[PDB]
Amino acid sequence: KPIWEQIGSSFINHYYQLFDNDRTQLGAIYIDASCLTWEGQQFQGKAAIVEKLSSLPFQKIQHSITAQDHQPTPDSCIISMVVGQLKADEDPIMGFHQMFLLKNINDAWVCTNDEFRLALHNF
């Protein structure tokens, strides 16, 4: 209901729908200084991020969100923590958590920081 929560949820929904259906379009939600750390691998800068995301087999994956937490930051950014499980077909692959730091630039929400970790947690 709160503004930061409405935007955070909308973004998360938008992010996973893009990821599970059109990864190539994800670049649109990042900026040059964005950072992504995927399973320990650091990809600093949009060029690096777009290459990594586009190098993922994921020729069939789907994310299932079990829980999400959103908070506004002092600088009016939105920090979001997502926890869930990513599947294949319908049978469970790893469990995961993902943190996003969202910032509004030229009036558009973009992700400046993306961190993803796989985890054998059922949540």
Minimal distance, residue 111 CB to a second copy, in Å: 11
Among 13, 42, 54, 104, binds a second copy (CB under 8 A): 42
CA dist list (Å): 109 to 44, 78, 103, 113: 19, 9, 6, 12
Asked if 63 touches a second copy (CB under 8 A), the answer is: no
State how far Cα 121 lies from the chain centre. Answer: 18
Comparing CB distances to a second copy, the nearer of 21 and 122 is 122
Asked if 91 touches a second copy (CB under 8 A), the answer is: no
Query: What Rg do the C-alpha atoms of the chain give, in angstroms?
Result: 14
Asked if 71 touches a second copy (CB under 8 A), the answer is: yes
Asked if 8 touches a second copy (CB under 8 A), the answer is: no
Other C-beta atoms closer than 10 Å to the C-beta of 97 total 17
